[PDB]
Amino acid sequence: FTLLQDQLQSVLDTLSEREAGVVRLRFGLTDGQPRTLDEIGQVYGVTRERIRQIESKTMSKLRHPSRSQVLRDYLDGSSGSGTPEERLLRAIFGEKA
Amino acid sequence: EVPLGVCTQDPDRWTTTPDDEAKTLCRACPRRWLCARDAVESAGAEGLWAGVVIPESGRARAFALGQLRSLAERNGYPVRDHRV
Ligand code: SF4
């Protein structure tokens, strides 16, 4: 069985280096502390607005079946976890999936 | 199981820099009409889904999502409206 953590790592590796880092910071996969968009601009040295553009665009890349179709099967087991991985999954798939 | 779309190989050639060979592969894709439904149900779907490059904004985006909704329903994959 491929663990959700390992599947997410492989999916994030299909993103650009900055997209992957922004995602990990935003959902606290880095250390367990999620960051605001202002903080992610702090990092990477860009405005809050570019962090927002990157986040929205990266989220739509992740939702496309090329990256989402094998993650979708983990949603039910991960929902109600309280984990950072569940948080990212729920942001990808929405709260009605 | 219904197989994965081939897009999972080289995701960027569908999400970010789509080309004609990718669209050709969508036309042959076994889950194409499932993918059309999912495009309508996904937040901010963009790029190549189900053989259609979905524009990022405007009336062109409205048309593409309308077409994908109608083809999805027509092929037995009706959109669940509670999920749009
Ligand atoms: S129809 Fe959907 S799942 Fe199939 S190759 Fe195209 S984008 Fe991928």
Side-chain angles (χ1 to χ4, degrees):
Chain A
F1 181 79
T2 305
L3 263 57
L4 168 61
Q5 311 172 280
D6 306 344
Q7 194 72 43
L8 265 185
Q9 294 289 96
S10 327
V11 170
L12 290 175
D13 275 340
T14 63
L15 301 174
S16 93
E17 301 188 337
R18 188 165 63 173
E19 300 174 323
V22 164
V23 164
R24 288 181 164 107
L25 285 172
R26 178 68 159 163
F27 294 93
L29 311 184
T30 37
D31 45 76
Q33 190 37 239
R35 309 295 164 83
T36 71
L37 306 175
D38 260 303
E39 285 163 348
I40 306 180
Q42 303 243 2
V43 195
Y44 298 104
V46 309
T47 66
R48 196 194 185 289
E49 199 65 344
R50 239 253 151 281
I51 290 310
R52 200 175 64 81
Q53 303 178 11
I54 301 170
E55 179 193 37
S56 80
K57 166 207 133 75
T58 302
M59 290 306 306
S60 76
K61 283 169 66 149
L62 290 165
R63 297 185 174 124
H64 182 281
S66 63
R67 305 186 164 87
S68 69
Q69 70 185 296
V70 298
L71 284 167
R72 191 178 297 267
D73 299 321
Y74 292 82
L75 190 62
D76 274 342
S78 186
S79 290
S81 270
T83 60
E85 297 75 28
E86 173 206 9
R87 279 215 283 291
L88 173 46
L89 275 190
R90 270 299 160 193
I92 297 175
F93 291 107
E95 319 280 329
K96 23 219 187 171
Chain B
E1 69 315 333
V2 91
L4 302 142
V6 58
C7 60
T8 66
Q9 314 148 66
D10 212 341
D12 263 351
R13 282 192 52 213
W14 278 251
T15 55
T16 310
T17 60
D19 53 40
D20 294 354
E21 301 91 299
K23 188 163 69 157
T24 289
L25 289 173
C26 281
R27 294 171 184 180
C29 183
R31 66 193 305 289
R32 185 178 181 192
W33 303 125
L34 180 60
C35 186
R37 187 198 69 175
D38 292 351
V40 184
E41 299 182 351
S42 165
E46 280 184 2
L48 182 56
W49 300 57
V52 172
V53 174
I54 298 164
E56 91 172 53
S57 83
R59 98 184 285 227
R61 173 184 186 77
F63 176 100
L65 293 184
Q67 196 178 19
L68 289 171
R69 176 193 278 277
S70 65
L71 297 162
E73 173 166 81
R74 232 119 97 238
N75 287 276
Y77 295 89
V79 172
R80 285 79 55 86
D81 281 299
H82 264 139
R83 305 200 21 169
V84 187

PDB file of all heavy atoms in Angstrom, chain A residues 23-54:
ATOM      1  N   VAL A  23       2.922  25.272  -1.836  1.00  0.00           N
ATOM      2  CA  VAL A  23       1.869  24.367  -1.367  1.00  0.00           C
ATOM      3  C   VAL A  23       2.215  23.809   0.007  1.00  0.00           C
ATOM      4  O   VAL A  23       1.386  23.800   0.930  1.00  0.00           O
ATOM      5  CB  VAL A  23       1.639  23.243  -2.396  1.00  0.00           C
ATOM      6  CG1 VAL A  23       0.848  22.094  -1.780  1.00  0.00           C
ATOM      7  CG2 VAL A  23       0.935  23.800  -3.592  1.00  0.00           C
ATOM      8  N   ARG A  24       3.462  23.358   0.169  1.00  0.00           N
ATOM      9  CA  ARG A  24       3.866  22.751   1.426  1.00  0.00           C
ATOM     10  C   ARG A  24       3.783  23.759   2.559  1.00  0.00           C
ATOM     11  O   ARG A  24       3.305  23.433   3.648  1.00  0.00           O
ATOM     12  CB  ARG A  24       5.271  22.186   1.311  1.00  0.00           C
ATOM     13  CG  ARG A  24       5.366  20.926   0.465  1.00  0.00           C
ATOM     14  CD  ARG A  24       6.797  20.418   0.412  1.00  0.00           C
ATOM     15  NE  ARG A  24       6.850  19.039  -0.057  1.00  0.00           N
ATOM     16  CZ  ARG A  24       7.276  18.663  -1.256  1.00  0.00           C
ATOM     17  NH1 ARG A  24       7.722  19.558  -2.122  1.00  0.00           N
ATOM     18  NH2 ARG A  24       7.248  17.373  -1.581  1.00  0.00           N
ATOM     19  N   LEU A  25       4.233  24.992   2.312  1.00  0.00           N
ATOM     20  CA  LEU A  25       4.108  26.037   3.321  1.00  0.00           C
ATOM     21  C   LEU A  25       2.648  26.326   3.638  1.00  0.00           C
ATOM     22  O   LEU A  25       2.271  26.441   4.805  1.00  0.00           O
ATOM     23  CB  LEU A  25       4.807  27.304   2.830  1.00  0.00           C
ATOM     24  CG  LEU A  25       6.332  27.282   2.872  1.00  0.00           C
ATOM     25  CD1 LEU A  25       6.877  28.511   2.178  1.00  0.00           C
ATOM     26  CD2 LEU A  25       6.805  27.246   4.314  1.00  0.00           C
ATOM     27  N   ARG A  26       1.803  26.418   2.610  1.00  0.00           N
ATOM     28  CA  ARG A  26       0.422  26.829   2.828  1.00  0.00           C
ATOM     29  C   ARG A  26      -0.320  25.832   3.697  1.00  0.00           C
ATOM     30  O   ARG A  26      -1.129  26.225   4.541  1.00  0.00           O
ATOM     31  CB  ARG A  26      -0.294  27.013   1.492  1.00  0.00           C
ATOM     32  CG  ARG A  26      -1.755  27.401   1.630  1.00  0.00           C
ATOM     33  CD  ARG A  26      -1.901  28.792   2.204  1.00  0.00           C
ATOM     34  NE  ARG A  26      -3.204  29.387   1.903  1.00  0.00           N
ATOM     35  CZ  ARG A  26      -3.700  30.433   2.555  1.00  0.00           C
ATOM     36  NH1 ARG A  26      -3.001  30.986   3.534  1.00  0.00           N
ATOM     37  NH2 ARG A  26      -4.882  30.938   2.226  1.00  0.00           N
ATOM     38  N   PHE A  27      -0.070  24.538   3.511  1.00  0.00           N
ATOM     39  CA  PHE A  27      -0.828  23.529   4.239  1.00  0.00           C
ATOM     40  C   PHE A  27      -0.072  22.906   5.403  1.00  0.00           C
ATOM     41  O   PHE A  27      -0.575  21.963   6.021  1.00  0.00           O
ATOM     42  CB  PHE A  27      -1.328  22.478   3.247  1.00  0.00           C
ATOM     43  CG  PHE A  27      -2.309  23.054   2.307  1.00  0.00           C
ATOM     44  CD1 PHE A  27      -1.904  23.550   1.093  1.00  0.00           C
ATOM     45  CD2 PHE A  27      -3.618  23.245   2.705  1.00  0.00           C
ATOM     46  CE1 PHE A  27      -2.802  24.145   0.260  1.00  0.00           C
ATOM     47  CE2 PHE A  27      -4.522  23.854   1.883  1.00  0.00           C
ATOM     48  CZ  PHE A  27      -4.119  24.303   0.659  1.00  0.00           C
ATOM     49  N   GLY A  28       1.112  23.420   5.724  1.00  0.00           N
ATOM     50  CA  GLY A  28       1.877  22.925   6.844  1.00  0.00           C
ATOM     51  C   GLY A  28       2.413  21.522   6.687  1.00  0.00           C
ATOM     52  O   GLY A  28       2.533  20.800   7.677  1.00  0.00           O
ATOM     53  N   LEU A  29       2.753  21.115   5.471  1.00  0.00           N
ATOM     54  CA  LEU A  29       3.462  19.858   5.272  1.00  0.00           C
ATOM     55  C   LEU A  29       4.934  20.004   5.608  1.00  0.00           C
ATOM     56  O   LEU A  29       5.631  18.997   5.770  1.00  0.00           O
ATOM     57  CB  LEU A  29       3.304  19.377   3.818  1.00  0.00           C
ATOM     58  CG  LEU A  29       1.904  19.342   3.199  1.00  0.00           C
ATOM     59  CD1 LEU A  29       1.925  18.757   1.798  1.00  0.00           C
ATOM     60  CD2 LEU A  29       0.973  18.537   4.053  1.00  0.00           C
ATOM     61  N   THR A  30       5.400  21.250   5.740  1.00  0.00           N
ATOM     62  CA  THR A  30       6.798  21.551   6.021  1.00  0.00           C
ATOM     63  C   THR A  30       7.184  21.219   7.458  1.00  0.00           C
ATOM     64  O   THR A  30       8.318  20.793   7.717  1.00  0.00           O
ATOM     65  CB  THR A  30       7.045  23.030   5.721  1.00  0.00           C
ATOM     66  OG1 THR A  30       5.887  23.778   6.115  1.00  0.00           O
ATOM     67  CG2 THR A  30       7.241  23.234   4.213  1.00  0.00           C
ATOM     68  N   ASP A  31       6.288  21.466   8.411  1.00  0.00           N
ATOM     69  CA  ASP A  31       6.638  21.369   9.823  1.00  0.00           C
ATOM     70  C   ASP A  31       5.385  21.223  10.677  1.00  0.00           C
ATOM     71  O   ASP A  31       5.475  21.072  11.905  1.00  0.00           O
ATOM     72  CB  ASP A  31       7.431  22.599  10.265  1.00  0.00           C
ATOM     73  CG  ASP A  31       6.824  23.895   9.750  1.00  0.00           C
ATOM     74  OD1 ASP A  31       5.792  24.346  10.304  1.00  0.00           O
ATOM     75  OD2 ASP A  31       7.352  24.448   8.760  1.00  0.00           O
ATOM     76  N   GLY A  32       4.216  21.267  10.033  1.00  0.00           N
ATOM     77  CA  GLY A  32       2.944  21.208  10.717  1.00  0.00           C
ATOM     78  C   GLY A  32       2.306  22.558  10.974  1.00  0.00           C
ATOM     79  O   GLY A  32       1.170  22.604  11.468  1.00  0.00           O
ATOM     80  N   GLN A  33       3.000  23.657  10.664  1.00  0.00           N
ATOM     81  CA  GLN A  33       2.453  25.003  10.823  1.00  0.00           C
ATOM     82  C   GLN A  33       2.113  25.594   9.463  1.00  0.00           C
ATOM     83  O   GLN A  33       3.024  26.035   8.744  1.00  0.00           O
ATOM     84  CB  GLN A  33       3.455  25.901  11.547  1.00  0.00           C
ATOM     85  CG  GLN A  33       2.927  27.266  11.983  1.00  0.00           C
ATOM     86  CD  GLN A  33       1.488  27.228  12.466  1.00  0.00           C
ATOM     87  OE1 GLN A  33       0.616  27.902  11.914  1.00  0.00           O
ATOM     88  NE2 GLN A  33       1.234  26.442  13.512  1.00  0.00           N
ATOM     89  N   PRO A  34       0.836  25.698   9.099  1.00  0.00           N
ATOM     90  CA  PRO A  34       0.470  26.365   7.845  1.00  0.00           C
ATOM     91  C   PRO A  34       0.819  27.835   7.881  1.00  0.00           C
ATOM     92  O   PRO A  34       0.812  28.469   8.936  1.00  0.00           O
ATOM     93  CB  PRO A  34      -1.051  26.204   7.779  1.00  0.00           C
ATOM     94  CG  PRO A  34      -1.412  25.346   8.861  1.00  0.00           C
ATOM     95  CD  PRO A  34      -0.351  25.389   9.896  1.00  0.00           C
ATOM     96  N   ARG A  35       1.086  28.391   6.708  1.00  0.00           N
ATOM     97  CA  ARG A  35       1.459  29.793   6.601  1.00  0.00           C
ATOM     98  C   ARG A  35       0.373  30.613   5.912  1.00  0.00           C
ATOM     99  O   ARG A  35      -0.321  30.128   5.018  1.00  0.00           O
ATOM    100  CB  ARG A  35       2.777  29.938   5.836  1.00  0.00           C
ATOM    101  CG  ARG A  35       3.910  29.056   6.359  1.00  0.00           C
ATOM    102  CD  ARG A  35       4.346  29.432   7.767  1.00  0.00           C
ATOM    103  NE  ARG A  35       5.135  28.361   8.381  1.00  0.00           N
ATOM    104  CZ  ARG A  35       6.438  28.173   8.185  1.00  0.00           C
ATOM    105  NH1 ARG A  35       7.128  28.998   7.405  1.00  0.00           N
ATOM    106  NH2 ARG A  35       7.059  27.161   8.785  1.00  0.00           N
ATOM    107  N   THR A  36       0.257  31.879   6.309  1.00  0.00           N
ATOM    108  CA  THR A  36      -0.571  32.800   5.546  1.00  0.00           C
ATOM    109  C   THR A  36       0.118  33.143   4.227  1.00  0.00           C
ATOM    110  O   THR A  36       1.313  32.888   4.035  1.00  0.00           O
ATOM    111  CB  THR A  36      -0.865  34.068   6.355  1.00  0.00           C
ATOM    112  OG1 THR A  36       0.321  34.868   6.471  1.00  0.00           O
ATOM    113  CG2 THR A  36      -1.363  33.703   7.730  1.00  0.00           C
ATOM    114  N   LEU A  37      -0.663  33.700   3.293  1.00  0.00           N
ATOM    115  CA  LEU A  37      -0.088  34.112   2.011  1.00  0.00           C
ATOM    116  C   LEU A  37       0.927  35.234   2.183  1.00  0.00           C
ATOM    117  O   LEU A  37       1.899  35.302   1.425  1.00  0.00           O
ATOM    118  CB  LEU A  37      -1.190  34.524   1.034  1.00  0.00           C
ATOM    119  CG  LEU A  37      -2.244  33.435   0.854  1.00  0.00           C
ATOM    120  CD1 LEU A  37      -3.389  33.925  -0.015  1.00  0.00           C
ATOM    121  CD2 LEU A  37      -1.622  32.179   0.277  1.00  0.00           C
ATOM    122  N   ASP A  38       0.715  36.120   3.160  1.00  0.00           N
ATOM    123  CA  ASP A  38       1.706  37.152   3.464  1.00  0.00           C
ATOM    124  C   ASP A  38       3.037  36.526   3.868  1.00  0.00           C
ATOM    125  O   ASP A  38       4.101  36.974   3.426  1.00  0.00           O
ATOM    126  CB  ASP A  38       1.186  38.074   4.575  1.00  0.00           C
ATOM    127  CG  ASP A  38       0.623  39.400   4.049  1.00  0.00           C
ATOM    128  OD1 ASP A  38       1.355  40.140   3.351  1.00  0.00           O
ATOM    129  OD2 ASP A  38      -0.556  39.712   4.350  1.00  0.00           O
ATOM    130  N   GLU A  39       2.989  35.491   4.725  1.00  0.00           N
ATOM    131  CA  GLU A  39       4.203  34.804   5.167  1.00  0.00           C
ATOM    132  C   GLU A  39       4.901  34.109   4.010  1.00  0.00           C
ATOM    133  O   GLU A  39       6.137  34.087   3.924  1.00  0.00           O
ATOM    134  CB  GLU A  39       3.885  33.808   6.282  1.00  0.00           C
ATOM    135  CG  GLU A  39       3.637  34.490   7.597  1.00  0.00           C
ATOM    136  CD  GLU A  39       2.925  33.625   8.619  1.00  0.00           C
ATOM    137  OE1 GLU A  39       2.403  32.554   8.257  1.00  0.00           O
ATOM    138  OE2 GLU A  39       2.898  34.034   9.810  1.00  0.00           O
ATOM    139  N   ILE A  40       4.132  33.517   3.116  1.00  0.00           N
ATOM    140  CA  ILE A  40       4.754  32.898   1.964  1.00  0.00           C
ATOM    141  C   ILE A  40       5.360  33.949   1.029  1.00  0.00           C
ATOM    142  O   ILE A  40       6.313  33.653   0.316  1.00  0.00           O
ATOM    143  CB  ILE A  40       3.739  31.974   1.280  1.00  0.00           C
ATOM    144  CG1 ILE A  40       3.195  30.995   2.328  1.00  0.00           C
ATOM    145  CG2 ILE A  40       4.388  31.203   0.153  1.00  0.00           C
ATOM    146  CD1 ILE A  40       2.178  30.008   1.767  1.00  0.00           C
ATOM    147  N   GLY A  41       4.790  35.157   0.948  1.00  0.00           N
ATOM    148  CA  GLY A  41       5.485  36.245   0.253  1.00  0.00           C
ATOM    149  C   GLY A  41       6.768  36.671   0.952  1.00  0.00           C
ATOM    150  O   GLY A  41       7.781  36.935   0.293  1.00  0.00           O
ATOM    151  N   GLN A  42       6.722  36.770   2.295  1.00  0.00           N
ATOM    152  CA  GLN A  42       7.918  36.889   3.148  1.00  0.00           C
ATOM    153  C   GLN A  42       9.023  35.975   2.616  1.00  0.00           C
ATOM    154  O   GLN A  42      10.115  36.402   2.244  1.00  0.00           O
ATOM    155  CB  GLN A  42       7.545  36.396   4.558  1.00  0.00           C
ATOM    156  CG  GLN A  42       6.389  37.036   5.311  1.00  0.00           C
ATOM    157  CD  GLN A  42       6.716  37.725   6.572  1.00  0.00           C
ATOM    158  OE1 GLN A  42       7.891  37.794   6.939  1.00  0.00           O
ATOM    159  NE2 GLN A  42       5.713  38.358   7.192  1.00  0.00           N
ATOM    160  N   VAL A  43       8.734  34.681   2.605  1.00  0.00           N
ATOM    161  CA  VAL A  43       9.542  33.696   1.896  1.00  0.00           C
ATOM    162  C   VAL A  43       9.455  33.993   0.398  1.00  0.00           C
ATOM    163  O   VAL A  43       8.502  34.617  -0.065  1.00  0.00           O
ATOM    164  CB  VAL A  43       8.986  32.293   2.221  1.00  0.00           C
ATOM    165  CG1 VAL A  43       9.966  31.213   1.842  1.00  0.00           C
ATOM    166  CG2 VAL A  43       8.622  32.187   3.697  1.00  0.00           C
ATOM    167  N   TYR A  44      10.436  33.551  -0.377  1.00  0.00           N
ATOM    168  CA  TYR A  44      10.370  33.761  -1.833  1.00  0.00           C
ATOM    169  C   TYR A  44      10.331  35.228  -2.276  1.00  0.00           C
ATOM    170  O   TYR A  44      10.404  35.505  -3.481  1.00  0.00           O
ATOM    171  CB  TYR A  44       9.142  33.057  -2.448  1.00  0.00           C
ATOM    172  CG  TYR A  44       9.144  31.564  -2.293  1.00  0.00           C
ATOM    173  CD1 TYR A  44       8.334  30.947  -1.346  1.00  0.00           C
ATOM    174  CD2 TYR A  44       9.967  30.770  -3.077  1.00  0.00           C
ATOM    175  CE1 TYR A  44       8.350  29.594  -1.184  1.00  0.00           C
ATOM    176  CE2 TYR A  44       9.990  29.410  -2.918  1.00  0.00           C
ATOM    177  CZ  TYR A  44       9.179  28.831  -1.967  1.00  0.00           C
ATOM    178  OH  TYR A  44       9.193  27.474  -1.801  1.00  0.00           O
ATOM    179  N   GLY A  45      10.213  36.172  -1.344  1.00  0.00           N
ATOM    180  CA  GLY A  45      10.441  37.559  -1.715  1.00  0.00           C
ATOM    181  C   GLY A  45       9.526  38.140  -2.772  1.00  0.00           C
ATOM    182  O   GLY A  45       9.989  38.923  -3.614  1.00  0.00           O
ATOM    183  N   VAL A  46       8.232  37.810  -2.734  1.00  0.00           N
ATOM    184  CA  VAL A  46       7.250  38.345  -3.674  1.00  0.00           C
ATOM    185  C   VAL A  46       6.097  38.958  -2.882  1.00  0.00           C
ATOM    186  O   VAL A  46       6.016  38.837  -1.659  1.00  0.00           O
ATOM    187  CB  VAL A  46       6.717  37.270  -4.650  1.00  0.00           C
ATOM    188  CG1 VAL A  46       7.861  36.521  -5.326  1.00  0.00           C
ATOM    189  CG2 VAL A  46       5.814  36.303  -3.926  1.00  0.00           C
ATOM    190  N   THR A  47       5.212  39.653  -3.597  1.00  0.00           N
ATOM    191  CA  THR A  47       4.077  40.292  -2.947  1.00  0.00           C
ATOM    192  C   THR A  47       3.029  39.253  -2.578  1.00  0.00           C
ATOM    193  O   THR A  47       2.998  38.148  -3.127  1.00  0.00           O
ATOM    194  CB  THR A  47       3.440  41.337  -3.857  1.00  0.00           C
ATOM    195  OG1 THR A  47       2.852  40.684  -4.987  1.00  0.00           O
ATOM    196  CG2 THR A  47       4.475  42.370  -4.320  1.00  0.00           C
ATOM    197  N   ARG A  48       2.135  39.636  -1.663  1.00  0.00           N
ATOM    198  CA  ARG A  48       1.021  38.758  -1.322  1.00  0.00           C
ATOM    199  C   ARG A  48       0.240  38.372  -2.573  1.00  0.00           C
ATOM    200  O   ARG A  48      -0.236  37.233  -2.691  1.00  0.00           O
ATOM    201  CB  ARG A  48       0.107  39.443  -0.306  1.00  0.00           C
ATOM    202  CG  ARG A  48      -0.861  38.512   0.396  1.00  0.00           C
ATOM    203  CD  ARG A  48      -1.958  39.281   1.137  1.00  0.00           C
ATOM    204  NE  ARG A  48      -2.831  38.396   1.915  1.00  0.00           N
ATOM    205  CZ  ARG A  48      -3.715  37.548   1.387  1.00  0.00           C
ATOM    206  NH1 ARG A  48      -3.855  37.452   0.068  1.00  0.00           N
ATOM    207  NH2 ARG A  48      -4.463  36.783   2.179  1.00  0.00           N
ATOM    208  N   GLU A  49       0.159  39.286  -3.542  1.00  0.00           N
ATOM    209  CA  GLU A  49      -0.624  39.028  -4.743  1.00  0.00           C
ATOM    210  C   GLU A  49      -0.030  37.932  -5.618  1.00  0.00           C
ATOM    211  O   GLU A  49      -0.790  37.115  -6.144  1.00  0.00           O
ATOM    212  CB  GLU A  49      -0.811  40.312  -5.551  1.00  0.00           C
ATOM    213  CG  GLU A  49      -1.971  40.287  -6.575  1.00  0.00           C
ATOM    214  CD  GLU A  49      -3.385  40.164  -5.968  1.00  0.00           C
ATOM    215  OE1 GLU A  49      -3.544  39.793  -4.781  1.00  0.00           O
ATOM    216  OE2 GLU A  49      -4.352  40.483  -6.694  1.00  0.00           O
ATOM    217  N   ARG A  50       1.286  37.897  -5.737  1.00  0.00           N
ATOM    218  CA  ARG A  50       1.882  36.793  -6.519  1.00  0.00           C
ATOM    219  C   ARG A  50       1.702  35.484  -5.747  1.00  0.00           C
ATOM    220  O   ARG A  50       1.412  34.521  -6.416  1.00  0.00           O
ATOM    221  CB  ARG A  50       3.334  37.064  -6.912  1.00  0.00           C
ATOM    222  CG  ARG A  50       3.574  37.047  -8.415  1.00  0.00           C
ATOM    223  CD  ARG A  50       4.322  35.828  -8.904  1.00  0.00           C
ATOM    224  NE  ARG A  50       3.939  35.526 -10.272  1.00  0.00           N
ATOM    225  CZ  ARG A  50       2.822  34.898 -10.594  1.00  0.00           C
ATOM    226  NH1 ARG A  50       2.012  34.474  -9.648  1.00  0.00           N
ATOM    227  NH2 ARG A  50       2.517  34.682 -11.856  1.00  0.00           N
ATOM    228  N   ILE A  51       1.847  35.460  -4.415  1.00  0.00           N
ATOM    229  CA  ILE A  51       1.626  34.210  -3.689  1.00  0.00           C
ATOM    230  C   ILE A  51       0.208  33.717  -3.960  1.00  0.00           C
ATOM    231  O   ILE A  51      -0.014  32.526  -4.205  1.00  0.00           O
ATOM    232  CB  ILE A  51       1.905  34.346  -2.180  1.00  0.00           C
ATOM    233  CG1 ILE A  51       3.401  34.521  -1.948  1.00  0.00           C
ATOM    234  CG2 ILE A  51       1.512  33.077  -1.447  1.00  0.00           C
ATOM    235  CD1 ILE A  51       4.230  33.477  -2.667  1.00  0.00           C
ATOM    236  N   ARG A  52      -0.758  34.638  -4.005  1.00  0.00           N
ATOM    237  CA  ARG A  52      -2.131  34.254  -4.327  1.00  0.00           C
ATOM    238  C   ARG A  52      -2.264  33.731  -5.760  1.00  0.00           C
ATOM    239  O   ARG A  52      -2.990  32.758  -6.008  1.00  0.00           O
ATOM    240  CB  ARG A  52      -3.083  35.426  -4.109  1.00  0.00           C
ATOM    241  CG  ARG A  52      -4.531  35.003  -3.961  1.00  0.00           C
ATOM    242  CD  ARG A  52      -5.422  36.183  -3.628  1.00  0.00           C
ATOM    243  NE  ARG A  52      -5.455  37.176  -4.692  1.00  0.00           N
ATOM    244  CZ  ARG A  52      -6.207  37.066  -5.784  1.00  0.00           C
ATOM    245  NH1 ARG A  52      -6.975  35.995  -5.947  1.00  0.00           N
ATOM    246  NH2 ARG A  52      -6.190  38.023  -6.708  1.00  0.00           N
ATOM    247  N   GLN A  53      -1.625  34.392  -6.731  1.00  0.00           N
ATOM    248  CA  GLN A  53      -1.715  33.895  -8.104  1.00  0.00           C
ATOM    249  C   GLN A  53      -1.143  32.489  -8.210  1.00  0.00           C
ATOM    250  O   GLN A  53      -1.788  31.583  -8.774  1.00  0.00           O
ATOM    251  CB  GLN A  53      -0.995  34.815  -9.081  1.00  0.00           C
ATOM    252  CG  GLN A  53      -1.387  36.290  -9.173  1.00  0.00           C
ATOM    253  CD  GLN A  53      -0.500  37.027 -10.190  1.00  0.00           C
ATOM    254  OE1 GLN A  53       0.239  36.403 -10.949  1.00  0.00           O
ATOM    255  NE2 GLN A  53      -0.542  38.356 -10.172  1.00  0.00           N
ATOM    256  N   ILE A  54       0.044  32.286  -7.626  1.00  0.00           N
ATOM    257  CA  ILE A  54       0.694  30.978  -7.632  1.00  0.00           C
ATOM    258  C   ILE A  54      -0.183  29.927  -6.959  1.00  0.00           C
ATOM    259  O   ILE A  54      -0.313  28.803  -7.458  1.00  0.00           O
ATOM    260  CB  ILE A  54       2.061  31.030  -6.919  1.00  0.00           C
ATOM    261  CG1 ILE A  54       3.051  32.015  -7.550  1.00  0.00           C
ATOM    262  CG2 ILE A  54       2.680  29.606  -6.803  1.00  0.00           C
ATOM    263  CD1 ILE A  54       4.284  32.214  -6.689  1.00  0.00           C
TER     264      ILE A  54
END
